[PDB]
Design a protein around this ligand. Structure first.
Ligand SMILES: [Ca+2]
Length: 314
DNA sequence: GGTAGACCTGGACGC
DNA sequence: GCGTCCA
DNA sequence: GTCTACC
């Protein structure tokens, strides 16, 4: 009853709503599609994870987004706490308006879009996003998810326990920068990326000015921000773009990897023109990225997510 | 400047 | 069952 | 995917 992960049915008095149609958000389409790797559908249609340093379970109906929080006496979320949810899902950005525009300028996006509504971008914490994606290079979403999990249990603050699941907050810079962190990560199976995590944590804290240097990129320009990130070990154009798009408020950023290449070739018959190479390469990926921006506009990254997400789901 | 190859790891094929 | 793929 | 050795 008062134990385990909650469900809307089981503990009615403990949930609160947020007007939000599925047309504007589909948890099942955004939470497991490679934006964040920390949400789990513990119960059908119920997703649990850490959001703004507290554990939440989310679930939706046709017109509402139901929220519950586990912090004191168990109670429904407060308006302020809920706002944190609204901010996390950038619910101010209207998806109907964006889909309309992308659809207007892209007959293909229109077709695909009809079947995959509610795919939007989560507004993630810079740090969690930096290291989670440092873990994403040359690797699949399933492993990535596990790695990030083991990483948070070993170095993140212990939050609360639900059933046999103990939640952890994402590790701090100091923690990741710690002595012997890499060796520990290797044992947790992060592979050669173990070194990137340790190295980037130290680089940020000991060479770039700390947390402030990262949190300052939100005011910077996509171009600036992207160049800065690339300095860090294990962070290339692709990783940098994900961070730009998902944590640094650069909605025009478009991550180019195997998925978008297939899409570009199969659905747009795209080919590199200025670049030197015919296949994937630093020059061509950059070009593909430009192609998508000119096609979709300032929120290309968000559009990219729609097709990217609808691709995984097929 | 613009390539090739190696690289931790493990669920997927495919023979 | 194993070696090559591939994310 | 990122990084490094190399024409
Ligand atoms: Ca590959």
């Amino acid at each position: 009853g008062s134990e385990g992960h909650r469900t809307l049915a089981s503990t009615p008095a403990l949930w609160a709503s947020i007007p939000c149609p599925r047309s504007e958000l589909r948890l099942d389409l955004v939470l497991p599609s490679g934006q964040s790797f920390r949400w789990r559908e513990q119960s059908p249609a119920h997703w649990s994870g850490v959001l703004a340093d507290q554990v939440w379970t989310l679930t939706q109906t046709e017109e509402q987004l139901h929220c519950t929080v586990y912090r004191s006496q168990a109670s429904r979320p407060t308006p302020d706490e809920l706002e944190a949810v609204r901010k996390y899902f950038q619910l101010d950005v209207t998806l109907a308006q964006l889909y309309h525009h992308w659809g207007s300028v892209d007959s293909h996006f229109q077709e695909v879009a009809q079947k995959f509504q509610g795919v939007r971008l989560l507004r993630q914490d810079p740090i969690e996003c930096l290291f989670s994606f440092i873990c994403s290079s040359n690797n699949n979403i399933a492993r990535i998810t596990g790695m990030v999990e083991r990483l948070c249990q070993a170095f993140g603050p212990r939050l609360i326990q639900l059933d046999d699941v103990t939640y952890h907050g994402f590790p701090s810079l100091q923690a990741l920068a710690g002595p012997e962190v890499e060796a520990h990560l290797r044992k947790l199976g992060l592979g050669y990326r173990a070194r990137y995590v340790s190295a980037s944590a130290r680089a940020i804290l000991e060479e770039q000015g700390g947390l402030a240097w990262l949190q300052q990129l939100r005011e910077s320009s996509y171009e600036e921000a992207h160049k800065a990130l690339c300095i860090l070990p294990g962070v290339g154009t692709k990783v940098a773009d994900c961070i730009c798009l998902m944590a640094l408020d650069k909605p025009q950023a478009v991550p180019v990897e195997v998925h978008m290449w297939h899409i570009a070739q199969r659905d747009y018959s795209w080919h590199p023109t200025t670049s030197q190479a015919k296949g994937p390469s630093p020059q061509t990926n950059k070009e593909l990225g430009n192609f998508f921006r000119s096609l979709w506009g300032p929120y290309a990254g968000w559009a990219q997510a729609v097709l990217f997400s609808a691709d995984l789901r097929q």
